[PDB]
Write a protein that binds this ligand. Structure first.
Ligand SMILES: NC(=O)c1ccc[n+]([C@@H]2O[C@H](COP(=O)([O-])OP(=O)(O)OC[C@H]3O[C@@H](n4cnc5c(N)ncnc54)[C@H](OP(=O)(O)O)[C@@H]3O)[C@@H](O)[C@H]2O)c1
Ligand SMILES: NC(=O)c1ccc[n+]([C@@H]2O[C@H](COP(=O)([O-])OP(=O)(O)OC[C@H]3O[C@@H](n4cnc5c(N)ncnc54)[C@H](OP(=O)(O)O)[C@@H]3O)[C@@H](O)[C@H]2O)c1
Ligand SMILES: CCCCCCCCOC(=O)c1cc(O)c(O)c(O)c1
Lengths: 315, 315
């Protein structure tokens, strides 16, 4: 079950989410990625940001080496972090990711965020410690550098993440554009279903990839603990009962049936193996309209901190 | 079961595909071509590109020598590789093919691809960066040189491969045209059935010859491994069950009943002998419409570098 991307490549519609907070030992990423592959996940989502590309890659390489999978069966995503937006930093950042994971190519490379951050090396030992420094980069030139990565065979497909419609149009309207982004990976779930942005993406042949599809990890560092817990929704629970599934499985299936490619992070063996059951059942059209009704414009990514960045996607 | 070509020659409607990847020992092509002829294949498709003309030729000569066939019962195709498009290179390339095969004439010589490549001795000439080097040739002059090869009795018939409608018209409308292409050998299967091109070809008396009719060899170099596997299609499988045949046989029969000449590669003795069974059954008109419904405009062969060639046939 794969979707055809606008560059002709194919992306599995269910992806494994690998991010876990820095308290979680990195050896866990190695363990759980092997478990994900053993359960049937083939699309694996990582990033320079996650500090896990080595462990994730070693999982992949391990399952390739022992003959459970071929490299060609695995669809591996990495992402260009925001301190590397300047065009001359793009290819080395990809190369660094490739060396960490010990892969020859990534199946997909994304611009992680339109919110560029100061690159390079400070120069004093402490002056800038702790601060968050924004940078200003024309993301079109970032995108050209991405296009060159694809032409070098380093990334099979290239795309973006956390872009809004305006930011997508800026790439789409670039003079001399060679490759459209294949996807826009954004927060998407029944509390923030992104239907308008989805319609836009579909009209341009860009796949929407949903993160926090199960309602986020609710990380204390950001997420308001009084925000409603997605998987406790009564409509999601009643559909789970009706179908003899679970609220997670309902929420994942919802995305698949609206043409969205869905990620699901779990570091728990049983939930990982549950999540692959998404292909065993289907929601009715009426079920789908009921889930559409749950939208409350709720972003679990309380980016509030970054709200004054000129490229903040919700300004 | 032959079709009358527009030059008066006859082409068998089922052809044996001889390409195998370079990991396959070169001796196999000799073995499998003999097996193909023993099974009933009479049309045999090779090319300079395949690096097997000696072995394929030996097979053909063997079966002629031992009396299983006469030379005139065999239809042998070779192809002019893209580094040899320049008019003065066309006849020596054909002569080199003929000397390798140890044959005096080919039944058919094709321009392999409209995508001309830098002349020389590499098959895939590459620049400093590893990028393939294109050439620019007026393919009308290539065609004139092909016309001369037919007049010299070195090729009984001439045609083209991987041409689109525009590229065909260019030849058809050439001033002083002597011979129309007898055929256009193109990627064609239920996921990319080419009906519009086929209608055009039929209106001009040009036979469409299908390659990757069984969904290609899915070579990593050119095919996305997560593309759908044609012979696993549930409609093909259900028709196979209905007819007590196989999905390969359904896919081959489809082509024959729409007036398409169809190639089938196999290096496996039992699949080779299965493939000749295509003449034992027939699909209903409803079966044919059901297969027509599978079209998803999917060409298995892809290349970022070749996509940017001015003569790329899918642009
Ligand atoms: N592009 C971006 O900027 C961006 C942002 C956020 C996320 N992402 C990507 O998207 C991935 C997923 O998003 P996310 O990390 O917010 O998490 P998510 O997929 O919404 O999952 C949230 C929580 O659901 C739990 N869970 C998983 N399967 C379950 C089931 N079947 N039943 C009940 N609970 C279940 C997990 O807990 P356990 O681990 O305990 O099972 C997990 O922490 C990330 O890991 C990352 O790859 C990208
Ligand atoms: N003009 C061009 O540019 C061009 C391009 C591509 C191909 N071609 C020509 O067309 C030929 C055929 O196309 P192709 O090589 O892409 O392969 P194909 O005919 O689409 O066959 C694909 C695969 O199907 C398998 N197969 C054959 N019979 C089968 C059966 N009865 N059941 C299940 N599987 C079966 C074969 O594997 P096994 O060998 O293991 O049986 C083969 O590798 C080539 O050999 C070449 O002559 C030309
Ligand atoms: C004070 C500002 C903190 C900056 C650090 C970012 C805050 C949130 O980090 C994450 O947990 C996170 C997880 C993912 O899966 C993502 O892709 C992603 O983009 C972010």
């Amino acid at each position: 079950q794969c979707v055809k991307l606008n560059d002709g490549h194919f992306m599995p519609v269910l992806g494994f989410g690998t991010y876990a907070p820095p308290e979680v030992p990195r050896s866990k990423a190695l363990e759980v990625t092997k478990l994900a592959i053993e359960a049937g996940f083939r699309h694996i989502d990582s990033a320079h940001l996650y500090n896990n590309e080595e462990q994730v890659g070693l999982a992949i390489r391990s399952k390739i080496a022992d003959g459970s999978v071929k490299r060609e069966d695995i669809f591996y995503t990495s992402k260009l972090w925001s301190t590397f937006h300047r065009p001359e930093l793009v290819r080395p950042a990809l190369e660094n990711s490739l060396k960490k994971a010990q892969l020859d190519y990534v199946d997909l490379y994304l611009i992680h965020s339109p919110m560029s951050l100061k690159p390079g090396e400070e120069l004093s030992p402490t002056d800038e410690n702790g601060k968050v420094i924004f940078d200003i980069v024309d993301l079109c030139t970032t995108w050209e550098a991405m296009e060159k990565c694809k032409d070098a065979g380093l990334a099979k497909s290239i795309g973006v993440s956390n872009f809004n419609r305006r930011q997508l149009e800026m790439i789409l309207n670039k003079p001399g554009l060679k490759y459209k982004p294949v996807c826009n990976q954004v927060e998407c779930h029944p509390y923030f279903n992104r239907s308008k942005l989805l319609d836009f993406c579909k009209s341009k042949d860009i796949v929407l990839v949903a993160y926090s599809a199960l309602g986020s990890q609710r990380d204390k560092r950001w997420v308001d603990p009084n925000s409603p817990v997605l998987l406790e929704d009564p409509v999601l629970c009643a559909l789970a009962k009706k179908h003899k599934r679970t609220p997670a499985l309902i929420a994942l299936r919802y995305q698949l049936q609206r043409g969205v490619v869905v990620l699901a992070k779990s570091y728990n063996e049983q939930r990982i193996r549950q999540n692959v059951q998404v292909f065993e059942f289907q929601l009715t059209a009426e079920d789908m309209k009921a889930i559409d009704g749950l939208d409350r414009n709720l972003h679990y990514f309380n980016s509030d901190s970054f709200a004054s960045h000129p490229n903040y996607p919700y300004s």
